[PDB]
Amino acid sequence: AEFDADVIVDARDCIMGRVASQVAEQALDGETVAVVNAERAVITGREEQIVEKYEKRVDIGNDNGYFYPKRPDGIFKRTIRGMLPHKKQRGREAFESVRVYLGNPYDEDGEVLDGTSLDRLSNIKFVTLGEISETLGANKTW
Amino acid sequence: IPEWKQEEVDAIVEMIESRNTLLERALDD
Amino acid sequence: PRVELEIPEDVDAEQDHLDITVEGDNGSVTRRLWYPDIDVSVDGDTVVIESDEDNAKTMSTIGTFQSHIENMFHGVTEGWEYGMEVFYSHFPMQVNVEGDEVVIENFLGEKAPRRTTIHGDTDVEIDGEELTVSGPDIEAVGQTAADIEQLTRINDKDVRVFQDGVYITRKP
Amino acid sequence: KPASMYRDIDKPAYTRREYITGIPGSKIAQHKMGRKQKDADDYPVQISLIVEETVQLRHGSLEASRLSANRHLIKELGEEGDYKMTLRKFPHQVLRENKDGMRAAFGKIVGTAARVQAGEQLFTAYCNVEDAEHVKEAFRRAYNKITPSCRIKVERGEEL
RNA sequence: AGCCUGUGUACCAGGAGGGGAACAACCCAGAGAUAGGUUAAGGUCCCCAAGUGUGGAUUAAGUGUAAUCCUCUGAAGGUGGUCUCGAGCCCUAGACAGCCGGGAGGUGAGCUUAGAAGCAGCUACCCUCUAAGAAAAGCGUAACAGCUUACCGGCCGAGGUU
RNA sequence: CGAGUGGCUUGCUACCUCGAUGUCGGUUCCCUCCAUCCUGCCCGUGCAGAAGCGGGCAAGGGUGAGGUUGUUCGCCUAUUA
Ligand SMILES: CC(=O)NC[C@H]1CN(c2ccc(N3CCOCC3)c(F)c2)C(=O)O1
Ligand SMILES: [Cl-]
Ligand SMILES: [Cl-]
Ligand SMILES: [Cl-]
Ligand SMILES: [Cl-]
Ligand SMILES: [Cl-]
Ligand SMILES: [K+]
Ligand SMILES: [Mg+2]
Ligand SMILES: [Mg+2]
Ligand SMILES: [Mg+2]
Ligand SMILES: [Mg+2]
Ligand SMILES: [Mg+2]
Ligand SMILES: [Mg+2]
Ligand SMILES: [Mg+2]
Ligand code: NA
Ligand code: NA
Ligand code: NA
Ligand code: NA
Ligand code: NA
Ligand code: NA
Ligand code: NA
Ligand code: NA
Ligand code: NA
Ligand SMILES: [Sr+2]
Ligand SMILES: [Sr+2]
Ligand SMILES: [Sr+2]
Ligand SMILES: [Sr+2]
Ligand SMILES: [Sr+2]
Ligand SMILES: [Sr+2]
Ligand SMILES: [Sr+2]
Ligand SMILES: [Sr+2]
Ligand SMILES: [Sr+2]
Ligand SMILES: [Sr+2]
Ligand SMILES: [Sr+2]
Ligand SMILES: [Sr+2]
Numbered sequence: 001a002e003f004d005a006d007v008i009v010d011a012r013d014c015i016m017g018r019v020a021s022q023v024a025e026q027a028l029d030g031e032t033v034a035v036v037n038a039e040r041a042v043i044t045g046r047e048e049q050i051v052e053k054y055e056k057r058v059d060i061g062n063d064n065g066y067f068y069p070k071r072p073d074g075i076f077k078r079t080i081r082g083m084l085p086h087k088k089q090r091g092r093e094a095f096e097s098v099r100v101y102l103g104n105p106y107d108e109d110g111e112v113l114d115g116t117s118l119d120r121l122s123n124i125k126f127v128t129l130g131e132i133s134e135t136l137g138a139n140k141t142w
Numbered sequence: 143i144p145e146w147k148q149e150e151v152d153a154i155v156e157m158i159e160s161r162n163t164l165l166e167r168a169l170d171d
Numbered sequence: 172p173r174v175e176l177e178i179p180e181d182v183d184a185e186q187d188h189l190d191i192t193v194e195g196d197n198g199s200v201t202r203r204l205w206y207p208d209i210d211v212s213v214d215g216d217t218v219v220i221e222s223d224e225d226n227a228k229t230m231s232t233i234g235t236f237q238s239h240i241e242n243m244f245h246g247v248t249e250g251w252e253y254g255m256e257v258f259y260s261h262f263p264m265q266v267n268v269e270g271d272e273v274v275i276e277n278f279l280g281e282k283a284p285r286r287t288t289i290h291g292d293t294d295v296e297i298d299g300e301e302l303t304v305s306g307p308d309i310e311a312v313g314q315t316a317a318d319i320e321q322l323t324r325i326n327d328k329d330v331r332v333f334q335d336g337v338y339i340t341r342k343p
Numbered sequence: 344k345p346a347s348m349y350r351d352i353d354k355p356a357y358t359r360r361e362y363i364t365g366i367p368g369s370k371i372a373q374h375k376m377g378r379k380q381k382d383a384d385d386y387p388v389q390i391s392l393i394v395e396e397t398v399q400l401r402h403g404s405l406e407a408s409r410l411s412a413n414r415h416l417i418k419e420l421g422e423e424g425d426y427k428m429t430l431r432k433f434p435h436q437v438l439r440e441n442k443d444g445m446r447a448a449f450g451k452i453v454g455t456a457a458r459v460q461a462g463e464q465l466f467t468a469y470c471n472v473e474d475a476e477h478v479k480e481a482f483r484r485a486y487n488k489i490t491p492s493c494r495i496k497v498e499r500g501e502e503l
Numbered sequence: 504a505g506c507c508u509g510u511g512u513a514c515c516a517g518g519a520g521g522g523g524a525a526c527a528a529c530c531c532a533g534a535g536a537u538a539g540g541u542u543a544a545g546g547u548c549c550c551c552a553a554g555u556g557u558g559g560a561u562u563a564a565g566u567g568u569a570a571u572c573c574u575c576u577g578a579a580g581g582u583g584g585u586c587u588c589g590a591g592c593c594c595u596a597g598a599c600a601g602c603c604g605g606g607a608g609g610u611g612a613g614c615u616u617a618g619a620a621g622c623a624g625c626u627a628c629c630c631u632c633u634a635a636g637a638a639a640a641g642c643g644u645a646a647c648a649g650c651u652u653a654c655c656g657g658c659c660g661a662g663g664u665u
Numbered sequence: 666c667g668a669g670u671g672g673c674u675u676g677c678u679a680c681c682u683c684g685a686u687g688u689c690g691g692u693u694c695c696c697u698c699c700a701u702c703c704u705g706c707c708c709g710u711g712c713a714g715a716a717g718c719g720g721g722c723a724a725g726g727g728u729g730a731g732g733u734u735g736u737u738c739g740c741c742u743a744u745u746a
Contacts, residue, residue: 017548017549018548018555020548020549021548021549021550021555022548022549022555023549024548024549024550025548025549028549028550044565045563045565046563046564046565049564049565050565053565080549082549082550083548083549083550084549084550085550085551086550091550114555115548115555116555121207121208121210122207122208123207124205124206124207125563143596144596147596148596150596150634151596161596161597161634161655161656161657162656162657163595163596163597164596164634166596167596226585226586227583227584227585227586228584228585326706326707326708328712328713328714329712329713329714330712331712331713332712332713332714333713345667345668345669346666346667346668347668347669401666403666404666404667406666407666407667408666408667410666411666444676444677444678445506445507445677445678448507486579486580486667487579487580487666487667488666488667489666489667490579490667490668491579492579492580503591503665504677504678505678505680506677506678506679506680507678507679573680577669577670578668578669578670579667579668579669580667580668
């Protein structure tokens with residue numbers, strides 16, 4: 001609810017890993033970032049092996065716990081956390097000044113970061129975060 | 143340059159004197 | 172590579188994005204033709220399938236897109252029809268169309284009716300021991316027919332002896 | 344015993360019969376097959392099975408490959424077919440096995456093997472242009488019973 | 504065998520510092536203090552200093568992103584997955600494939616055999632018509648029939664095949 | 666005959682521990698692996714059917730009671746999917 005984002009990024013049709021790497025770099029530079037339309041971000045590869053990896057992460061765990069997100073919401077934010085020293089002061093500060101959303105709760109339309117776009121016309125082997133979440137069992141609230 | 147085709151175009155022209163391409167060939171003579 | 176398909180006078184083909192729609196006197200069919208770097212478009216009187224790549228994998232899909240489109244042309248005009256025959260040795264098999272699915276009763280004596288839902292706007296007309304599956308979408312028709320035959324599949328017993336079931340008699 | 348035990352050339356050459364006793368006999372029945380009264384020059388085709396890696400081949404394997412090859416040639420060209428095949432290597436290297444821990448470990452003699460350098464011809468056949476494929480099949484069965492990969496090479500033969 | 508036992512050498516032992524996730528001996532490097540600068544090994548999407556660098560190609564398996572290694576596996580065998588290069592032969596006098604038509608008579612050859620007629624076995628394997636057609640390459644029959652390969656013609660139209 | 670994987674058996678080594686890392690079998694209680702015995706779904710058959718034999722996917726659940734023997738193992742009995 002209300003997030004003074006210095007930058008609003010549109011993840012739609014964008015390679016998640018590539019977006020995350022830039023959002024991290026900017027959060028560490030002090031920018032407050034809001035990633036939009038997470039459910040529509042994409043990750044290249046063979047949907048079958050991709051899903052096996054994310055399902056394995058869901059099955060891993062124990063008493064100590066390995067809480068892994070299932071919604072495109074968290075999947076994306078965890079992806080970003082892995083690019084930040086979130087256990088350090090400076091790192092946790094950057095991370096906490098970053099938020100991912102389902103759809104776009106803002107009025108403006110996020111911008112599209114350079115090099116992160118995927119041309120659907122030249123690509124068939126890729127998957128949507130939303131699709132992954134649905135497979136993982138998430139409740140399609142988007 | 144198949145020889146049997148050449149010999150045919152002749153044999154055909156011979157009977158014309160006294161495959162379709164080969165017949166059209168002989169007619170062209 | 173580039174191939175050009177002159178569309179039949181009986182037909183009209185429109186396409187926006189990755190979806191192509193073909194309409195004729197027999198109906199209409201819409202398909203999605205999506206493959207890396209293969210552009211499908213309607214250039215007035217002809218449909219065009221082209222790409223800058225010529226690798227085996229691309230050439231394969233191009234030829235596939237072609238037959239899919241020509242099949243759509245054929246489907247909207249002449250249409251597609253598969254002919255099937257119901258055959259039984261001891262128990263009279265009862266094949267009927269009920270709703271949007273064909274129901275088969277008393278297969279090999281079974282008390283529970285075997286059934287399958289019809290795909291698309293496929294028409295399954297039955298007359299005696301003969302069935303005729305037809306429609307404009309060859310994909311839908313083809314499956315419906317196949318589905319009907321698969322509906323009497325048996326794995327438990329020797330098929331050479333128990334040959335009851337409906338079979339595709341004529342492929343279009 | 345697995346060939347992994349002796350397929351590599353990781354030991355000195357051990358072939359001196361004058362200092363080695365109890366060497367088991369060879370299981371290789373013949374080194375010259377087919378019509379051994381006829382010359383090799385009397386044939387239009389000459390095909391050799393070439394080893395692609397340096398290795399040691401125990402006589403047990405030479406016999407199995409040779410046998411499984413000549414056997415095919417016999418089944419396809421007859422007990423007297425117009426062909427001739429040669430196994431050109433002989434198992435000179437003596438093999439041991441330490442069969443008491445590592446004390447006085449020098450092994451007792453257990454067998455023999457032939458050292459084959461990569462690129463060499465283990466077998467070589469000579470046939471008529473007709474049976475050229477029957478020999479290629481014989482070798483295919485032969486390199487399936489010896490450690491290394493092999494190239495089936497047609498030396499004298501251009502009816503191709 | 505991260506085994507045992509030699510030999511030469513450099514290293515650890517007794518060797519910091521930089522790199523290698525961590526890690527006696529692998530790489531750079533031999534080091535007084537303090538300070539500025541430039542490199543070495545190694546690295547430049549983020550974590551993490553420096554490229555989401557350039558020209559070009561391949562890979563679709565997340566192969567791979569693993570110098571060395573007890574530590575990083577992957578083999579014999581197989582692959583019309585895909586890319587690249589070479590050779591031979593066939594082809595607009597129409598190839599390869601497909602589809603359509605023809606696949607004929609003497610004659611169901613002779614022999615054996617009740618029987619045998621392309622096709623149980625044995626021998627031979629000839630000539631007519633013709634633009635083709637075996638004394639029949641594979642099924643099939645009790646034996647016939649029937650179904651096709653060879654072989655010819657048409658339709659088609661561009662590379663094909665080894 | 667050839668090529669491998671595992672690390673349950675055994676052997677080998679002597680790297681760790683001799684200012685102490687308590688044995689075998691059993692029991693009780695928890696998690697796991699798949700090279701699957703049953704159960705689910707399949708393929709082949711020397712598949713008529715029934716019952717089998719062989720193979721594929723698959724580790725969700727199940728795999729029990731008893732006689733000798735400390736036994737592990739195994740032999741034996743009646744049940745059992
Ligand atoms: C109590 C003790 O000695 N603690 C010190 C060490 C040695 N050890 C041990 C060694 C041999 C044996 N055995 C087992 C049976 O075969 C004879 C030797 C053993 F039980 C136990 C162990 O666990 O820790
Ligand atoms: Cl957990
Ligand atoms: Cl951290
Ligand atoms: Cl793709
Ligand atoms: Cl020094
Ligand atoms: Cl991955
Ligand atoms: K001890
Ligand atoms: Mg010391
Ligand atoms: Mg940086
Ligand atoms: Mg890997
Ligand atoms: Mg010790
Ligand atoms: Mg399994
Ligand atoms: Mg059965
Ligand atoms: Mg379980
Ligand atoms: Na990826
Ligand atoms: Na988890
Ligand atoms: Na001793
Ligand atoms: Na030193
Ligand atoms: Na370090
Ligand atoms: Na990987
Ligand atoms: Na192993
Ligand atoms: Na199970
Ligand atoms: Na017992
Ligand atoms: Sr950056
Ligand atoms: Sr050695
Ligand atoms: Sr081999
Ligand atoms: Sr780049
Ligand atoms: Sr490039
Ligand atoms: Sr280790
Ligand atoms: Sr290695
Ligand atoms: Sr291999
Ligand atoms: Sr498995
Ligand atoms: Sr079962
Ligand atoms: Sr035990
Ligand atoms: Sr016992």
